[PDB]
Design a protein around this ligand. Structure first.
Ligand SMILES: CCCCCCCCCCCC(O)(P(=O)(O)O)P(=O)(O)O
Ligand SMILES: CCCCCCCCCCCC(O)(P(=O)(O)O)P(=O)(O)O
Ligand SMILES: [Mg+2]
Ligand SMILES: [Mg+2]
Ligand SMILES: [Mg+2]
Ligand SMILES: [Mg+2]
Ligand SMILES: [Mg+2]
Ligand SMILES: [Mg+2]
Lengths: 296, 296
């Protein structure tokens, strides 16, 4: 009687979900909430999306970006993000994966509210879908090289294609949506370059700031490491090639060992100067773009 | 200049992604595929989607389903799935999370193959988006309750709402896509599919213990339907010690067979949670068998 009446009311209704439930599930996300808006703002100078639409694009980018870091720290076994303990060490890996994944879809739902024009909406959705695919392919390859090392040592070209998918993904997602929504040449090439500079700069500073250098502990095929591995292989420097591999494989937190690998990159392969130079050349493609081939 | 030409070609093209890249990052997913549509077929006697479209709906649901299991097994620290080692123990948690999440978006991309009609497409994506949101909400609660126990002891009503989200989400996703695509067929079957998912989930929780009586749900610490009844039964009857022992055993995350059998016999003879669940399941099945208010 009563049990069946309760079941009947339950199945004839939408699933029950409270604001308290929403709060529980958002915990890992809120935790990470404690400049990208600047770049969005600056680009809108050209795009001129209305303010309320610009706010939704910005919320979408914030959700995806913050959620991708919660997942990334779990994938990279990172103890710290923004000078604070990572969410998965506080709320657990289970809750943090689910919460991050949940925000991907909340971000997806915000896309629908950018426009109700049916053609444009499909385009927006396709842009969101293609770049989420690219980000995962790039992340997938970066993780694969790290966890299967030393099965595959990527070349510089391979690394740059990985970065186009991995880092170019959110940059392109943001730009492509603003461009599709513009009431006003495509700035995608420029945003790709920006993304590449950004990622190499990141790999470079991880080592340079130390000289934590968590990238070494993580064992990732960073730009300076890819340079170092290919340089030693090409010069037939077997021992140095193997010592680089051994340290990355150690997944070490030992300061002295991390410093030893940085010494190999500074004195044997000169990979840090190689990378500094590479970043400058990339940046000069923008600084010397007098004809505004990339710049607006 | 050769680097510039190289960088220029790179940023003015789509990110490069090979079929070999696709294979490498698909490993975690291919692994679960070596494991074993009829329900989809029955529903179609009512909906009458043509076979080629049905096949696409079925492909979308299998991708989401299989992907779900990869992540759920990480979240539940499961050692086995479909009689074999779980993907995360083989390829690592990092690649398994990324690949599974990657497939969520591949599934998303298949939605566009269901139709060329913009209005309809928009509705199919909304359904997809809504039930993925519901799935993560329910999963979020099941994990929170479990990992933070005894902070929250769910009531039967709370468990049923979590299930409407977590288990109902996939059943409704399939059915709602079919009802939207239906060229034809009576009242909506959502209520019925909601009830089917509840019966399915509780029967699941039930057999997990009954088959053992590996009862892996105990090792997991899951607030299953029989466990929710026992914890509420003991609190209501003043069985302080038994309430506390149930909590203690769940929090051990133990694989000891005798310890799991003790807990099951507490549910058998002390709280009568197994008989309660078996009768609850029967009443649900009878709500249908003794009904065309729900059925077609
Ligand atoms: C949109 C959700 C899925 C995103 C999948 C890709 C995430 C890439 C994150 C890369 C983060 C880093 O840039 P970090 O220095 O750790 O912040 P890295 O781990 O690649 O170095
Ligand atoms: C994109 C899909 C995300 C889905 C998130 C929810 C997944 C729920 C999976 C539930 C699996 C189980 O049914 P199992 O018995 O382990 O196969 P349970 O862990 O809930 O018992
Ligand atoms: Mg990282
Ligand atoms: Mg990473
Ligand atoms: Mg980094
Ligand atoms: Mg499970
Ligand atoms: Mg689970
Ligand atoms: Mg189960």
């Amino acid at each position: 009687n009563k049990m069946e009446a309760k079941i009947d009311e339950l199945i004839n209704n939408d699933p029950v979900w409270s604001s308290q439930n929403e709060s529980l599930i958002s915990k890992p996300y809120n935790h990470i909430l404690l400049f990208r808006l600047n770049l969005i703002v600056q680009i809108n100078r050209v795009m001129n999306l209305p303010k309320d639409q610009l706010a939704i694009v910005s919320q979408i980018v914030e959700l995806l970006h913050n959620s991708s870091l919660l997942i990334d720290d779990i994938e990279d076994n990172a103890p710290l993000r923004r000078g604070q303990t990572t969410s998965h060490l506080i709320f657990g890996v289970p809750s943090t994966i689910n919460t991050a994944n949940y925000m991907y879809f909340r971000a997806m739902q915000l896309v629908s509210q950018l426009t109700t024009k049916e053609p444009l909406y499909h385009n927006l959705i396709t842009i969101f879908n293609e770049e989420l695919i690219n980000l995962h392919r790039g992340q997938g390859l970066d993780i694969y090289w790290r966890d299967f090392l030393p099965e595959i040592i990527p070349t510089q070209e391979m690394y740059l294609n990985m970065v186009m998918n991995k880092t170019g993904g959110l940059f392109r997602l943001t730009l492509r949506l603003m461009e599709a929504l513009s009431p006003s040449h495509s700035l995608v090439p420029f945003i790709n370059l920006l993304g590449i500079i950004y990622q190499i700069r990141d790999d470079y500073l991880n080592l340079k700031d130390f000289q934590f250098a968590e990238d070494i502990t993580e064992g990732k095929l960073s730009f300076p490491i890819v340079h170092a591995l290919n340089f030693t292989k090409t010069k037939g420097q077997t021992e140095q090639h193997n010592e680089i591999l051994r340290i990355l494989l150690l997944r070490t937190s030992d300061k002295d060992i991390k410093l030893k690998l940085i010494q190999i990159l500074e004195f044997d392969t000169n990979s840090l100067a190689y990378t500094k130079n590479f970043i400058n050349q990339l940046v000069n493609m923008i600084k010397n773009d007098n004809e505004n081939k990339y710049l607006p």
